[PDB]
Design a protein around this ligand. Structure first.
Ligand SMILES: CO/C1=C\C(C)=C\[C@@H](C)[C@@H](O)[C@H](C)C/C(C)=C/C=C/[C@H](OC)[C@@H]([C@@H](C)[C@@H](O)[C@H](C)[C@@]2(O)C[C@@H](O)[C@H](C)[C@@H](C(C)C)O2)OC1=O
Ligand SMILES: CO/C1=C\C(C)=C\[C@@H](C)[C@@H](O)[C@H](C)C/C(C)=C/C=C/[C@H](OC)[C@@H]([C@@H](C)[C@@H](O)[C@H](C)[C@@]2(O)C[C@@H](O)[C@H](C)[C@@H](C(C)C)O2)OC1=O
Ligand SMILES: CO/C1=C\C(C)=C\[C@@H](C)[C@@H](O)[C@H](C)C/C(C)=C/C=C/[C@H](OC)[C@@H]([C@@H](C)[C@@H](O)[C@H](C)[C@@]2(O)C[C@@H](O)[C@H](C)[C@@H](C(C)C)O2)OC1=O
Ligand SMILES: CO/C1=C\C(C)=C\[C@@H](C)[C@@H](O)[C@H](C)C/C(C)=C/C=C/[C@H](OC)[C@@H]([C@@H](C)[C@@H](O)[C@H](C)[C@@]2(O)C[C@@H](O)[C@H](C)[C@@H](C(C)C)O2)OC1=O
Ligand SMILES: CO/C1=C\C(C)=C\[C@@H](C)[C@@H](O)[C@H](C)C/C(C)=C/C=C/[C@H](OC)[C@@H]([C@@H](C)[C@@H](O)[C@H](C)[C@@]2(O)C[C@@H](O)[C@H](C)[C@@H](C(C)C)O2)OC1=O
Ligand SMILES: CO/C1=C\C(C)=C\[C@@H](C)[C@@H](O)[C@H](C)C/C(C)=C/C=C/[C@H](OC)[C@@H]([C@@H](C)[C@@H](O)[C@H](C)[C@@]2(O)C[C@@H](O)[C@H](C)[C@@H](C(C)C)O2)OC1=O
Lengths: 51, 36, 159, 198, 148, 53, 158, 345, 159, 159, 159, 159
């Protein structure tokens, strides 16, 4: 009465814990990638009529 | 962090008990040195 | 190899220690990046606020301190022959502090960017920005506290 | 989309594996019952506690930045609204408080159990109860924090225009916080009968 | 936070003591509290010169509240005494109420037996013990509940 | 006391359109009071949390 | 021991208690947020009508009460010292899924109706009856889900 | 949902823009400005508003309606550029697309001055400073549309909008510049509508789709009426001038293309109920501006929507127009129609 | 247990009931929301359209009634010592009624939105809109018929 | 629990029973929704065309009839002890009819909305619209024929 | 059952029979929908070409005939005792014809849409579109040929 | 082999070393690329600032040094017969340093880009950018500290 020969209870627990951690990591990496630098205030205004 | 958390505990947890608020601040007509 | 102390038990402790710093560093990096964008945007117009507006970057870095503290404290109970209970305690503490620090760092980054961009225009908003940033950092503090509570039970009555 | 393709490939692989096990006569080999019985309830309890506190904090931070961005944006012209709309941030952080309390209560039940009674009925029930109550509290606090943050952002933007808007949107924000309160109540109710591991 | 009503109970009178004391409860360190006290005293004793000279935004702040910081530092020192926390260490000023066993082997888990009560502050026999957190956490949670 | 605090003051105001405003404001105050009772008592645990941290 | 009451049945029993509360909270939050957005929008121009415009919010909050009731009844049948049959666990999971997703659908509908119902009620109060009827039609979905959950848990207990 | 992901990048932008909307003059402030006696009194009254002391540096004798308009426009454009410079990504692209509409008008005005040989200083002054590509003052000399495109328009972000204008004659005149402006702005409207549909999220997507449909219908009507007086217009070629993203598309746009008379234009517009009364009676441009203000007010009802930026910009452009009108009426003392201002807040 | 009546047999019946409720509720909610948005958009201008446009909402609400009926019937047909053939039949009935009702609700929402947005001009569109809404509701009725025919065989000649 | 007639065999029959009416209802809903959008868009221009433009909705509704009849033929051929081959045939017939009706409904909607849109302009486009709608309906008729032919083999020389 | 003729062998045959009509119907639906919208767009202006530009719809409607033929010939060669070789061959033939007819339908739809949208500009575009549609239909013809050959070798020298 | 020293134990150590170098290289690459974009964009107008703006590149280039140091230190503890605990520790240390240095590189690349872009017009922003970038180099340092602390326990009391 074992869970599996290769997909043992310990291996499945480790795999799904790592899956949860990797899901959180992937979400965080998507957040960090979606971060965009606001270039408007980091450049010199090229308008002579105004500013 | 502790200073500002005690600020929070006084503004929310403490003042809401007895602070009616919405009072007129005292701004008297006084002369002061206005920096240029 | 004991039923109470499997050979994969140290995996949970090691991965929790790794996650405690990984997710807190990710959140701190997001906060630092967003607050740096805000600070560099505002300093072109108000260079005098360069050192006053660095607070969001500082408070983003405290999350990394919380993650480092949990990672250091988890390594105390790490061992080859450790129980599965200890391993899952370590994993739970690491996950708690990591996810809490990630959320806190994201919130600190967003609110710090908003506050630095809005305090140059209105100097009265510095107090509000600092307050909301403290409210965001106390979340990582709560994750730290939960991690410490879990760690206090790591190696007690364990055989 | 790469993510959609990955999801579809995972679904196809799962279906093919299930059909292969079922057709060959080994359908019972994909046994979720043995997976749940042979999994350490410490895993479920610790995952429940960690996800409860993590998702509570995630929701608190979510509401906090949604409300804070709007408070700072509307405070440029009306700085007077920050102190009055700090109640919104308080209502966003109370869900983190709820998650912390639930985590304390659940961690009070993390006792070392003997090897012979490792997977007993009471221990398995405690593991399942802690896992699912932590999931419930964490997800409820996440949802409540997001809703309270949205409501607080609207309240700050509206009471920047006229201070009478805050006293009418605070009702909606209290309605939002009621969701987190009910989530905490249900999470406590699930783990009320769950005794410590023995 | 807001301006009080006319002839309303001022919130600034009880704040003088409550705010530094709640900060001290959260802070709770006799060494860090001493550093805060010294930092505030540097401003307090030299307040005439600082008043005469121009101050920046970060210097005008923390100087108008120099007495605030002084009170927070003094109360932090008091709470750190009540926590026996001096730079994260402990002070063995009085006699502990816990007695360790007469003799034990190295590395053997030992549980102290009660002999009395610690006069002022948390017992210093709770420093470095395995169940130090289990006691300090309950103490501080009930302290927070009661003082709230 | 919950119905007491919710009703007695509006009842006195009725037995001295403003009645509806008073009644609604008293409801809002009652609900906020009951919520922030447990909210404030729970949030005072931040003293312990920050001390431990 | 009992073949019909395995020790992993409480997992599915709590999965219905978790799903019910979580999805009811999701639906209630969606309704309350999408109604508060419209209320705030109409407040800047017509703040006087906010007083009666909270109906979508209050009936989207009742969905959370439906989920709370179903979760309370599900968790009352779960105890470590009790023969919790796998039938009961599966059917409580069905209770939770049914009521949680019915309340989520009701909350989504109430949000989409109160987002534009109050934004058009500000123009004239004659649309109030129509908006209330549409919101009742949205709430009866969660009512049906709660009724199904009640029947399910009553049958599963016995 | 709507506000779950908005405040990550645009929360501060939305807050500041809605505060600016709160700063828009109401009916009472408009009446107070109407009751002024001189331009100095108008400046003093505007000081009490959210304009602040924007005319503080201006002396009493230098105070003029043109200068008041210049300062109000400068403040508005400074606010818009500050808001753009605090935003990135989809919001930054949205702001750039907003600027492109003024940039097209700027290049058209520069070309009109180039053929008209007007004063360079006044030509620069009249140009809208929001839409300013680096080679804009070059337009004061360049005339050939092929040379125009190759030496100027490829450099600008207006390059994708110049596709089918090569068919016309190489020599450029007033009719040529008018049709080039119409074609360029139609292509810009199509590109902006596509950008809103793909990138701008709900509810800002639907709101700006409706707003762009209104703008396309407005300019389609304007183009049809301005080409009605001309006898050199080809019904099939006019389809390249009328935008295809508005509510008129496709049936009403088709009928307008085949419309040759004012009654024909009314019959073409009979498909849509909103635009029938505009040509039925009254001042057409007044009705367009009134409905634009109503649409902006409706756009400000939605929270966590980036269309509030467009609603604000149109509202405060109309506000600056109203301030200029009031100042001119006060300076000329012709207060017969001083109350002919459009306001919804 | 039994090969024909395993312990995990009522899982399929529970999943069928859940699918029926979930999908019929999503369909009804989508129909109601897509109808109500057009209701709000159009009813502002005309007085008599308050009930001309409630028909899509009424039609979409009957889908939830179909889900309720099927779910109640399968709940009353559920059992502990229940053969997995009954579980499969209940799962099929629940899936059929739920997804057919989801399709009917989506169609009702789209049709109602379009018809209400286009019917503010004249009330003669009302009859055609009613006809098309009936056409869309017949899909949910067919799903109900299939589910009822299945559940009639759930416990017929079952050992 | 015979190998040729396993216990799980009715699962595929139930899935085909559901899918025959689930996907046909999905396609019918898509076609009805798109056609109704087109009609309600074009109802204002001419009210007399309303009764002639409903043909796409009618033909979209025949797909649901195909799914319903294929189900009723399939859904009555189930049993506690049915062969796995019979279950496979029922699943295949259900999938064939459902995913042929889904395609037929998709094509009917896409053709019909444009057809009724053009009917407001060209009155003679009606005949071409009818032709293309018949062409799209034959696609679902083919799936109906395939399902009917499969069902003749479900319990033919089956042990 | 025999190791060469397992009880799950008819699953592949049923899946192939279903797919042979499902995917060909999907391709025919695409090639009919795009062709129909193009035909309606063309007929909005001129109805003379309405009955002449139906060739893309007819060509996409022959793909469904290929799928129907393959499904009919597969549902006759499969039984309860068929081998895995026969089931795999039937599945391969079904997939071949279905996923070749889907590509043929996609190409036919695109080509026909372009040709009928541009047909009013040049009468010779009708002949050009006919020529390109001849090339696009041959893809489905090749898929049908491969499926026919496979089904010919389905039950040859099979035990 | 041994239960405490499995044959697959070196897999986790190799993955840890590979991740330690790889993720730090990715972070350093992102930082270097974005900071170089900033420098090349800003140097077009400030020939005096070819250097003094490469500091973001330099600090981004120290993250790769952290990853290299951790990879070198975990290679020397890699063996054929090594305990699974040692492999888990090496994997955890590698993941910690790599995924902390990746976040540090992201933050450095964003902050340094913003700082160099601002410094093209405001020379005072250089100091602010230098201090803010240290707040991400310190995240990399925290990850390195955690990795070293873990690796110190890799072979300590291991059988
Ligand atoms: C280079 O090491 C500096 C910071 C680092 C790397 C800290 C790590 C331990 C970090 O990983 C931790 C996690 C965060 C931390 C412990 C920040 C404290 C920073 C110092 O602050 C006292 C500033 C501070 C001296 C400096 O930032 C400013 C000059 C300033 O003094 C200007 C003042 O106007 C302002 C009031 C004051 C405030 C914002 C604190 O900062 O030192 C530094 O830069
Ligand atoms: C913050 O929520 C409030 C109480 C809470 C938390 C109830 C939960 C326990 C809920 O789970 C319970 C279970 C159900 C519920 C939802 C009660 C609503 C009561 C009042 O709603 C009528 C509102 C409040 C909206 C009311 O005071 C309105 C001002 C008003 O009276 C204004 C009238 O113009 C309007 C006609 C009337 C409508 C909604 C009937 O509501 O009391 C509150 O403070
Ligand atoms: C609001 O639903 C009403 C009761 C509720 C909530 C029933 C739920 C169980 C329902 O959710 C479920 C889904 C069943 C359902 C769908 C009932 C419909 C009832 C009537 O609907 C015809 C209206 C009907 C009297 C009224 O609501 C109509 C608007 C109307 O009065 C307007 C008239 O102009 C019109 C001629 C006529 C109908 C045919 C449009 O009746 O009864 C109601 O009170
Ligand atoms: C909504 O209830 C209608 C049909 C239902 C419920 C069908 C289901 C059973 C379904 O399973 C399917 C679709 C089978 C079916 C039985 C279709 C019959 C349609 C009728 O057609 C005879 C029209 C028809 C009476 C009506 O649509 C028009 C008045 C009209 O008569 C106008 C004529 O100008 C036109 C020539 C004629 C054409 C288009 C058929 O339709 O009934 C309906 O709508
Ligand atoms: C009603 O049965 C029709 C189509 C169906 C159901 C086909 C299936 C059996 C399918 O399995 C396929 C497509 C079999 C197939 C190939 C049928 C061809 C039929 C007729 O084609 C001769 C046209 C034809 C009468 C019609 O389309 C036009 C009026 C036309 O006669 C116009 C002529 O100008 C033109 C020369 C001619 C050409 C294009 C063939 O078509 O009937 C139809 O629609
Ligand atoms: C040739 O590649 C350079 C370094 C390499 C290969 C590093 C790797 C081993 C890597 O693994 C990392 C980055 C190791 C590291 C930390 C190197 C520091 C290098 C010096 O940085 C002070 C500059 C320095 C000699 C000089 O090149 C600078 C540009 C400068 O002379 C310009 C001055 O204006 C400026 C004030 C100052 C620095 C601080 C910018 O020194 O070496 C280089 O460039």
């Amino acid at each position: 009465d074992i869970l599996s020969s290769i997909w043992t209870e310990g291996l499945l627990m480790c795999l799904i814990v790592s899956a949860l951690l990797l899901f959180i990591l992937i979400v965080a990496l998507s957040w960090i990638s979606n971060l965009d630098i606001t270039y408007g205030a980091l450049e010199k205004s090229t308008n002579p009529i105004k500013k | 962090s502790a200073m500002l958390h005690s600020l929070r505990l006084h503004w929310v947890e403490s003042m809401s008990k007895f602070f009616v608020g919405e009072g007129l601040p005292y701004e008297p007509f006084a002369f002061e040195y206005k920096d240029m | 190899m004991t039923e109470l102390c499997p050979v994969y038990a140290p995996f949970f402790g090691a991965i929790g220690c790794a996650s405690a710093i990984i997710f807190t560093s990710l959140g701190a990096a997001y906060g630092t990046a967003k607050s740096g964008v805000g600070i560099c945007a505002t300093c072109v117009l108000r260079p005098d606020l360069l050192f006053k507006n660095i607070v969001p970057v500082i408070m983003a870095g405290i999350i990394a301190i919380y993650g480092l503290v949990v990672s250091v404290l988890v390594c105390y109970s790490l061992g080859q022959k450790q129980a599965l209970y200890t391993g899952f305690i370590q994993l739970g503490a690491g996950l708690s502090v990591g996810l809490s620090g990630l959320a806190a760092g994201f919130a600190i980054g967003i609110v710090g960017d908003a506050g630095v961009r809005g305090s140059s225009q209105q100097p009265r908003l510095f107090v509000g920005m600092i307050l909301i940033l403290i409210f965001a950092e106390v979340l990582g503090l709560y994750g730290l506290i939960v991690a410490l509570l879990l760690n206090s039970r790591a190696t007690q009555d364990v055989v | 989309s790469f993510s959609h393709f990955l999801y579809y490939l995972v679904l196809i692989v799962v279906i093919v594996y299930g059909l292969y096990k079922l057709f060959t006569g080994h359908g019972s080999d994909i046994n979720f019952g043995k997976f749940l019985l042979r999994t350490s309830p410490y895993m479920w309890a610790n995952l429940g506690i960690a996800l409860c506190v993590g998702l509570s904090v995630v929701g608190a931070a979510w509401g906090i930045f949604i409300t804070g961005s709007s408070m700072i944006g509307a405070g440029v012209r009306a700085p007077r609204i920050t102190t009055k709309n700090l109640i919104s941030i308080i209502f966003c952080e109370v869900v983190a408080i709820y998650g912390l309390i639930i985590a304390i209560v659940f961690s009070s039940k993390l006792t070392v159990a003997t090897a012979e009674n490792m997977y007993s009925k009471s221990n398995l029930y405690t593991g399942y109860s802690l896992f699912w109550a932590g999931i419930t509290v964490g997800a409820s606090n996440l949802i409540c924090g997001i809703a309270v943050g949205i409501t607080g952002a609207t309240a700050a933007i509206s009471d920047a225009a006229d201070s009478a808007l805050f006293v009418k949107i605070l009702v909606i924000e209290i309605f939002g916080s009621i969701l987190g309160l009910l989530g905490l109540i249900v999470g406590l109710l699930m783990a009320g009968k769950a005794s410590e591991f023995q | 936070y807001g301006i009080a009503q006319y002839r309303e109970i001022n919130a600034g009178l009880p704040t003088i003591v409550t705010f530094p004391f709640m900060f001290a409860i959260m802070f709770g360190d006799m060494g860090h509290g001493f550093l805060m006290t010294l930092a505030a005293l540097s401003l307090v004793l030299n307040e005439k010169k600082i008043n005469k000279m121009k101050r920046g935004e970060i210097f005008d702040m923390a100087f108008t509240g120099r007495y605030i910081i002084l009170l927070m530092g003094v109360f932090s020192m008091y709470t750190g005494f009540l926590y026996n926390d001096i730079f994260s260490k402990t002070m063995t000023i009085f006699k502990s109420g816990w007695k360790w066993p007469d003799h034990w082997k190295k590395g053997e888990s030992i549980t102290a037996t009660s002999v009395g009560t610690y006069p002022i502050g948390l017992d210093w026999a709770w420093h470095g013990t395995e169940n130090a957190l289990l006691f300090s956490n309950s103490y501080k949670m009930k302290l927070s509940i009661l003082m709230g | 006391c919950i119905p007491w605090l919710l009703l007695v003051k509006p009842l006195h105001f009725k037995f001295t359109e403003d009645f509806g405003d008073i009644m609604i404001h008293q409801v809002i105050h009652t609900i906020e009071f009951c919520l922030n009772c447990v909210s404030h008592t729970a949030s005072y645990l931040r003293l312990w949390a920050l001390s431990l941290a | 021991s009992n073949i019909y009451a395995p020790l992993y049945a409480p997992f599915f029993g709590f999965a219905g208690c978790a799903a019910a509360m979580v999805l009811s909270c999701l639906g209630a939050a969606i309704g309350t947020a999408k109604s508060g957005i419209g209320i705030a929008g109409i407040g800047t121009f017509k703040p006087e009508l906010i007083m009666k415009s909270l109906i979508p919010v209050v009936m989207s909050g009742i969905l959370a009460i439906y989920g709370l009731v179903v979760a309370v009844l599900i968790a009352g049948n779960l105890s470590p010292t009790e023969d919790y049959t796998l039938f009961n666990g599966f059917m409580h999971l069905s209770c939770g899924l049914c009521v949680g997703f019915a309340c989520l659908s009701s909350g989504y509908a109430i949000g989409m109706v109160g987002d534009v119902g109050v934004r058009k009620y500000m123009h004239q109060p004659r649309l109030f009856v129509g908006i209330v009827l549409i919101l009742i039609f949205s709430e009866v979905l969660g009512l049906y889900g709660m009724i199904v959950a009640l029947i399910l848990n009553t049958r599963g207990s016995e | 949902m709507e506000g779950v992901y908005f405040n990550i990048d645009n929360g501060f932008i939305e807050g500041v823009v809605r505060g600016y909307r709160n700063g828009l003059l109401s009916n009472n402030q408009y009446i107070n400005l109407t009751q002024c006696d001189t331009l100095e009194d108008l400046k003093l009254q505007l000081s009490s508003t959210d304009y602040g002391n924007f005319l503080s540096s201006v002396s009493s004798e230098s105070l003029t309606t043109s200068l008041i308009q210049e300062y109000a426009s400068s403040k508005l454009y400074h606010e818009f550029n500050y808001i753009r410079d605090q935003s990135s990504g989809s919001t930054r692209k949205f702001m750039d697309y907003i600027t492109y509409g003024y940039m097209i008008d700027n290049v058209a005005l520069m070309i009109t001055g180039t053929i008209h040989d007007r004063d360079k200083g006044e030509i620069l002054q009249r140009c809208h400073p929001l839409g300013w590509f680096d080679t804009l003052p070059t337009l004061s000399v360049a005339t050939d549309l092929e040379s125009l495109y190759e030496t100027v328009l490829v450099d600008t972000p207006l390059a994708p909008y110049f596709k089918n204008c090569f068919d016309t004659a190489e020599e450029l005149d007033d009719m040529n510049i008018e049709i080039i402006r119409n074609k360029l702005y139609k292509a810009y409207l199509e590109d902006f509508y596509n950008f809103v549909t793909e990138e701008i999220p709900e509810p800002a997507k639907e709101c700006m789709q409706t707003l762009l449909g209104f703008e396309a219908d407005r300019r389609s009507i304007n183009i049809a009426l301005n080409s009605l007086q001309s006898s050199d217009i080809d019904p099939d070629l006019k389809s390249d001038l009328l935008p295809n993203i508005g509510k008129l598309y496709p049936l009403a746009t088709f009928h307008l293309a085949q419309a040759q008379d004012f009654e024909g234009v009314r019959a073409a517009l009979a498909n849509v109920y909103e635009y029938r009364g505009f040509l039925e009676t009254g001042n057409l441009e007044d009705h367009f501006y009134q409905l634009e203000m109503e649409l902006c007010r409706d756009a400000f009802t939605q929270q966590f929507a980036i269309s509030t930026v467009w609603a604000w910009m149109k509202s405060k452009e109309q506000e600056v127009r109203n301030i200029t009108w009031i100042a001119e009426c006060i300076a000329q003392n012709q207060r017969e129609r001083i109350n002919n201002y459009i306001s919804v807040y």
